[PDB]
């Protein structure tokens, strides 16, 4: 089944990509925020933290936009399935090449 597998595989790879986002530096000198705080003092390490925050925000907003697109597609498919349930199953549909 492709229609039942893509909706799960795409979600799994999106979650995996979200996990992979925190392994990137976004141009900084470290990925985890704790290492910079431990090795550099917070007054000078503020720009590094801020660029990490804006990179993580960009990644999360990209994930949110992709999830909204997937939600719209699944809602369209669910409306189609509901119409099919109401017509093809819950009665006999005169629409040829639909059931």
């Amino acid at each position: 089944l492709g229609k039942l597998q893509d909706v799960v595989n795409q979600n799994a790879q999106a979650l995996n990509t979200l996990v992979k986002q925190l392994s990137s530096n976004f141009g900084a000198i470290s990925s985890v925020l704790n290492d910079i705080l431990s090795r550099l003092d917070p007054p000078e390490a503020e720009v590094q933290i801020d660029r990490l925050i804006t990179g993580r925000l960009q990644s999360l907003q990209t994930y949110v936009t992709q999830q909204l697109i997937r939600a719209a597609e699944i809602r369209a498919s669910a409306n189609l399935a509901a119409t099919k349930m109401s017509e093809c199953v819950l009665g006999q549909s005169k629409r040829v090449d639909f059931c």
Partner: peptide, 30 residues
């Protein structure tokens, strides 16, 4: 009248309320 519906109707032999076809359907997709 001759229509065998045991494939789509649930079977009481298993604790799950599933038909054999939807048993195979759940086992097919991860």
């Amino acid at each position: 009248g001759g229509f065998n519906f045991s494939q789509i109707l649930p079977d009481p032999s298993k604790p799950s309320k599933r038909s054999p076809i939807e048993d195979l359907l759940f086992n097919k997709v991860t």
